[PDB]
Chain A
Amino acid sequence: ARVTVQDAVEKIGNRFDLVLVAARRARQMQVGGKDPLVPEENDKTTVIALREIEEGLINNQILDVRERQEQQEQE
């Protein structure tokens, strides 16, 4: 995800949807201070979220149902 975001593009299916999903994940890492599921190896949150999509943990519907799970566990 440092040099090329190609395999994350093939995992997502859309460049613009990849930007939107990684933006929400990076906002959750910058604002809320959530736990990154990958080793950060002293990278920035943009590359960490892109590496999470590169592995395949972060998707639009997966992050939405996870956010829904945290919201329903808040209530």
Chain B
Amino acid sequence: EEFDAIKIALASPDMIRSWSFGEVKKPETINYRTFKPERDGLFCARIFGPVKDYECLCGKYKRLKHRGVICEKCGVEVTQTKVRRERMGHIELASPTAHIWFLKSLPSRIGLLLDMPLRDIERVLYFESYVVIEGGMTNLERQQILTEEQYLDALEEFGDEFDAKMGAEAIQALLKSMDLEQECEQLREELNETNSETKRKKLTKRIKLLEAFVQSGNKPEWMILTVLPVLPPDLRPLVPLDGGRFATSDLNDLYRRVINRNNRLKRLLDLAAPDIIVRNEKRMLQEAVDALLDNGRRGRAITGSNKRPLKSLADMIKGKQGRFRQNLLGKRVDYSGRSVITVGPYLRLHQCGLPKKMALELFKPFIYGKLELRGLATTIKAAKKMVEREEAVVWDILDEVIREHPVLLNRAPTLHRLGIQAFEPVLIEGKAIQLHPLVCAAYNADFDGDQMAVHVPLTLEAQLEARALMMSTNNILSPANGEPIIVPSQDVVLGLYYMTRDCVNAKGEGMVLTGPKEAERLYRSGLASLHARVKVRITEYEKDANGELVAKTSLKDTTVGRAILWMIVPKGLPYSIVNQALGKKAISKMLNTCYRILGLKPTVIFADQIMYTGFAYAARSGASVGIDDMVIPEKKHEIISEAEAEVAEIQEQFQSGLVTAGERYNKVIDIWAAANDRVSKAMMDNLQTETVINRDGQEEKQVSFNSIYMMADSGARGSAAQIRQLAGMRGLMAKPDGSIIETPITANFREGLNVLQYFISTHGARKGLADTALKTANSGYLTRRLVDVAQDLVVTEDDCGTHEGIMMTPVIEGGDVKEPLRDRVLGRVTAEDVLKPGTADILVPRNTLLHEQWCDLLEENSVDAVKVRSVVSCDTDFGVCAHCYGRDLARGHIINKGEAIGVIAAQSIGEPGTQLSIKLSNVKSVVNSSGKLVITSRNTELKLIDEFGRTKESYKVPYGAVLAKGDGEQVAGGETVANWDPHTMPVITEVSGFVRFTDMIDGQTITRQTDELTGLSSLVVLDSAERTAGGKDLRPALKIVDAQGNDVLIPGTDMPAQYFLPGKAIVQLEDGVQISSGDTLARIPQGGLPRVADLFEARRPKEPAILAEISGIVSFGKETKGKRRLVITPVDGSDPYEEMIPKWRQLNVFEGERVERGDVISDGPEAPHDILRLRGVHAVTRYIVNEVQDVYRLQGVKINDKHIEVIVRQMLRKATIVNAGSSDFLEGEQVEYSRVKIANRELEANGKVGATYSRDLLGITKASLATESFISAASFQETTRVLTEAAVAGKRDELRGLKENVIVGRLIPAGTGYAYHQDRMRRRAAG
């Protein structure tokens, strides 16, 4: 019951006969006169144990006094009836048949072991063609598949020397006669002479398979089923119906088929049947056994009586309704309720209203215990009936029991971890669970008919989890990003916006008040409104250096509503918290500031009090919607008429025949977009500032008190797009073919649409409703795949002591700041120092958690980039340390050791899937004759650094682009500095002089033609695919020389100044002219959720970018073929590398320059596998994080980058070995990177050479399947393939995963169970 490992292997026939208790020899299950089970049947009592507790079948032994005996009359062993689901039988098959798993699950393992094709093995098993096992003559070798005619020829020819059998018994004899170590040694010799790619891969597959058999100790004859085991008859039960008829399982039908055909084969072998009949019966038994093991696998699936295919054993375990994903991971659970949810705003943050009857049904054994303790019930039956009669003493005892006993409120689908929270229940009269209004932003639940499950923790440990870890006052901050999710939502927000907004001359403006209490007294007496601009006295408490609170008291120019909220805001916050109009972002910043200053308990009472006052003043407001409140702008018809006249003008121009149809289409869309923007701007102007009728200074202007604008500007419900569709113009609606329709829906939802506009709108409405369903399914599939990769990651160590890290620069692509340094680095731990003078000389040491104060210091001193320790670079085996991960985002401090990171990271990523001066760097340039500077590099980036040192923008310039500004020059804004040729790629030079037209002749490499505009001849270099026989061995060169003709050298190198230009070049420069330096010479021409799923599944795209694998210069080596090879030789050593590039793809790097490690040779998207293998682990981590965050910022969802780094670290777990030392890794075996790190640590400890490696970015599906745990892999996906590979290789499970301990039934090593698991681990180590 306390086992360390779950070892899986193949089953010998002796082991199957050791499992069984009796041979099942009859197909009939039970009788019909009296329903006792038969003898040697499918339900038999002698084989599968007794039917009743401690009773035989005849009734002789009938008590526990005879504890365990065998009945001499009927054979039924007197035991408990629990052994009807623990005892197996066995069927003794006449002809030994083949297992369908180890034959049809590709790779077949029988074709891979015997080295025979699967079609020929299937022909042998189908009794269509003989196979020869052994033969003494040289005519018939081993495994020569003969036909019937060839066997009848060989029988009359030799008849005595060879032995050829047909069927599965022949394959059993073949696997018996083969020799595992002899074939392994012969293939090890065969691998060494020559290495073709397909032959070496097939040979190493077979060698890995044979070495798996020898090291696991299995035998190859065990794949042929001779003895078939039988499931116990309470696991293939016989359940009745309500009308006397029986409804059995499909396994009883399949077992009846196998037993009947096996008994008929025994009868046909005893009756001396003909060869055709006994061969067909052997084939039928093979088909029946294969159907029972996997129905839908071999051929046509055997259907039952109701025309549906039967459920086999492989269909019971594998699938969506299989044993794993329906009963092992997620089980049904007692002590559980379910009801509709309503709103309780009178509650606190940690309370929920359970009904009386539902909680009486929930807490029933607890009421039994308190009834028998207080002496009000003698026995359990009396207590049962006192609860069932619902007495007043039962209600009082229930009120005592339910006090301080938290229950979990679950709501499906539980996307993120805040979908389960523990609440102290309060008994109410009703039938609906009254939630708090604040937690329904965490639950994503509105009250339109939702339903929530109520689970009751029983034990004291479970009540303490629900009180310390899962209480609703503890998880305020979201674990995705460190922002509070217990936030006012739409109604508190409308009330607080109406409070802290101010009018101009409302009622009682310009008084002086003794404080917040007198302001509240003035409003509730009625002498002053909520919008009177008044001077109040405010006594705010600032924070000292220690925990003391100093005070200041002055007069502030406030409103009455802000002076009412100052009674609510606790001591410790400034007045600039309250002194603005509070939208949803403003109240979020209020709760965040109150958290970081005060803690948790002032934050909880502030949220409850701000919700109470928000609800109360939204009720006192009366903020109603009306038909006079959706104010249509009075200049809508004029703009619409002008736009229709302009569209009709371009239409009649097209009907005259001047402008084409596509340009008319693009012009009409651009005109209607401009018209829609103008109407929306006029609508927003006339709705924001319509309130102008004022007094007490003059006719003044202010923001409007319109309720539609109020519930838009507050961030409560809706946005400016929704207000535009209500009041302005509906806009341009799209067809389901993607193309935007030309005429738009001009009417809004106030004037009412006509028939055709509504029928056009139904396209997008049904499309959006259809799209939403698809993304949720995709997001849940993505969330399951992400969780099943990141299962095995937990915090183990407190610190690993590494020196690596990822330098976090703010993402500065384009013209704006996407993420600031504060959002990028707040929470992580600094790897190195910050070495810059700056203004204050900030020097944070290593191993420092970056708090908000340290990040404020970084913002003040304006640091460009800081290097912090990431999860990917952590050097801890089987788990990460706390200092590399950094801050527990749900709490706000450093992460406790033992808490599972990866499940939180996978949930936080897959939850919004249902919502989806001039600075020059890396340059090589030369000053031209005019100062218009040109760049001779491709990887040049143009950085835009401010005068303080920080970076403002970023731009990448092309190679050969012109530039007017040098380094250190500060140009003003709006100046166009980026000037470049977009379609042509120049071939510019850096030296001056004359040109020598060498190695180009008119006729075989260049085309003699002229330009059609100027009359000058132009020498276009002809491409090598259309050249003649004279141009297959030459490369034309623009031999730039000096003014008289000597070969000028490049300054710095020893390469001659040559320029091998490619084809299709517009050579305008002729011989005998003067050429400057830096001038041109010739012209050479050129979703959200699927993108996230393709980044995480690590897919090679449709057009990968060719990169340079070794640093050095590049030259061409192979001629007379269009596949351009690059002999990229290094500048120090020899070249062992070449590269094959197809015909039509263009090249960016010419054959005269030198590339670094990982240079873009061919443009396009770059594949993440070669990104890793060439650039580095930190580079592929930064690529995946940036390209995922681009999607999540496009849609507007905040997600911290540490979660994406956790998924990347779980993707990079494998590491193939390129060269071994003295370790037990021979060649190309994809072992885990933690295993080779431990092996290299041991080898460098005892002083040896060590073994190098090379990591590889596996996808999510391939990583979770190549996880070393067969139980985790089979619970995720592909149960047939995972169990087949584990059974052949003889693997074992060490029980170290969270999913593994969910399946087995132990405490997970995640959080509270981590102490128990490390105690068990040290107990196993110390003994």
Q: Is there direct touching of A and B in the complex, by C-beta distance under 8 Å?
A: yes
- Interface positions, chain A 1-36, Cβ under 8 Å from B, are 2-6, 8-9, 14-20, 22-23, 26-27, 30
Does residue B1312 face the partner (Cβ distance < 8 Å to A)? yes
In the complex, whether B339 has a CB less than 8 A from a CB of chain A is no
Shortest distance from the beta carbon of A59 to any chain B beta carbon, whole Å = 15
A43 interface contact, C-beta 8 A: yes
Contact B896 A46 (CB under 8 A): no
Q: B460 on the interface (CB 8 Å rule)?
A: yes
Give the distance in Å from the alpha carbon of A30 to the alpha carbon of B464 in the complex: 14
Q: In the complex, which residues of chain B have a beta carbon less than 8 angstroms from the beta carbon of A14?
A: 896
The answer, among B348, B471, B474, B1312, for a CB contact under 8 Å with A16, is B1312
Cβ < 8 Å to A, chain B residues 771-803: none
Tell me whether A6 and B1312 are in contact in the complex, defined as CB-CB below 8 angstroms, given that A27-B460, A30-B460, A46-B463 are known contacts. Answer: no
A53 CB, nearest partner CB in chain B, Å: 10
- The smallest C-beta distance from B264 to any residue of chain A, in angstroms, reads 63
In the assembled complex, the Cα of A3 lies from the Cα of B464 at a distance in Å of: 13
State whether A23 touches B461 (Cβ < 8 A).
yes
Nearest A residue (CB) for B1316: A20
Chain A interface extent, by class = 20 to 34
On whether the beta carbons of A4 and B604 are closer than 8 Å, the reply is yes
Q: Nearest chain-B residue to A6 (Cβ)? A: B600
B601 touches A19 (CB 8 A): no
Q: Are B468 and A3 in contact (CB under 8 A)?
A: no
Interface of A is mostly: helix
Given A19-B464, A22-B464, are A46 and B473 neighbors across the interface (CB < 8 Å)?
no
The reply to whether B464 and A23 contact each other, CB–CB distance below 8 Å, is yes
Residue interface mask B1226-1240, A partner, CB < 8 A = 1: 000000000000000
Indicate which residue in B348, B404, B465, B604 contacts A19 across the interface (CB closer than 8 Å). Answer: B465
Neighbouring B residues of A2 by C-beta, 8 Å: 404, 424
B461 to A18, Cβ gap below 8 A? no
- Cα distance A4–B474 in the bound complex, in angstroms: 7
Give the docked Cα–Cα distance between A30 and B369 (Å): 13
Chain B nearest CB, measured from A9 CB (Å): 7
> Which residues from chain B contact A43 at a C-beta distance below 8 Å?
404
Looking across the interface, which residue of chain A has its beta carbon closest to that of B349? Answer: A3
Q: How far is the CA of A2 from the CA of B473 in the complex (A)?
A: 11
Residue among B465, B468, B474 facing the most chain A CB atoms (10 A cut-off): B468
Contact size class for B?
20 to 34
Contact indicator A46/B469 (Cβ below 8 Å): no
For residue A36, give the distance in angstroms from its CB to the closest CB of chain B. Answer: 14
Q: Tell which of B348, B404, B467, B899 touches A5, judged by Cβ atoms closer than 8 Å.
A: B467
A58 lies within 8 A of chain B by Cβ:
no
Query: With A5-B468, A43-B404 as given contacts, are A16 and B1311 in contact (CB-CB < 8 Å)?
Result: yes
Give the residue name and chain of the A residue nearest to B459 (CB): A23
A16 to B601, CA, bound (A): 20
Task: Please tell me if the beta carbons of A47 and B473 are within 8 angstroms of each other in the complex.
Answer: no
Which residue of chain B has the shortest Cβ distance to A9 in the bound complex? B468
Shortest beta-carbon distance, B830 to chain A, in Å?
23
Question: CA A20 – CA B1311 in complex, angstroms?
Answer: 11
Option from B403, B468, B471 in Cβ contact (under 8 Å) with A44: B403
Considering only CB atoms, which chain A residue lies closest to B401 in the complex? Answer: A44
Residues of A within 8 A of B469 (CB): 15-16, 19
Shortest CB-to-CB span from A65 to chain B, Å, is 18
**Inter-subunit contact B468/A15 (CB<8 Å):** yes
A22-B468, A44-B405 given; A4·B1312 CB < 8 A = no
* Chain A: minimal CB distance from B1311 (Å): 5
Task: Tell which of A8, A18, A23 touches B460, judged by Cβ atoms closer than 8 Å.
Answer: A23
B898 within 8 A of A: yes
Give the Cβ gap from B672 to chain A, nearest Cβ, in Å: 57
- Tell yes or no: B1314 within 8 A of A by CB: yes
Q: Which chain A residue has the least Cβ–Cβ distance from B899? A: A16
Flag whether B350 is at the interface (Cβ < 8 A): yes
Q: Which residues of A contact B473 (CB under 8 A)?
A: 3-4
Bound CA–CA A20/B468 (angstroms): 11
B1315 within 8 A of A: yes
Residues of A within 8 A of B601 (CB): 3-4, 6
Q: Mark B459-486, 1 if CB is under 8 A from A, else 0.
A: 0110111011101011000000000000
- Let me know if B68 is at the binding interface, CB within 8 A: no
Q: How far is the CA of A16 from the CA of B464 in the complex (A)?
A: 10
How far does the alpha carbon of A47 sit from the alpha carbon of B896 in the complex, in Å? 23
Chain B, Cβ-Cβ closest to A60: B1315
One of B460, B463, B599, B899 near A6 (C-beta < 8 A): B599
Q: How far is the CB of B470 from chain A (nearest CB, A)?
A: 10
How far is the CB of A13 from the nearest CB of chain B, in Å?
9
**27 intermolecular pairs with C-beta atoms under 8 Å apart:** A3-B473, A3-B604, A4-B471, A4-B601, A5-B468, A6-B599, A6-B600, A15-B1311, A16-B898, A16-B899, A16-B1312, A17-B1315, A19-B461, A19-B469, A19-B1312, A22-B464, A22-B468, A23-B464, A26-B460, A26-B464, A27-B460, A44-B403, A46-B463, A46-B464, A47-B467, A50-B464, A50-B467
Q: Which 3 residue pairs spanning A and B have beta carbons closest together?
A: A16-B1312, A6-B600, A19-B464
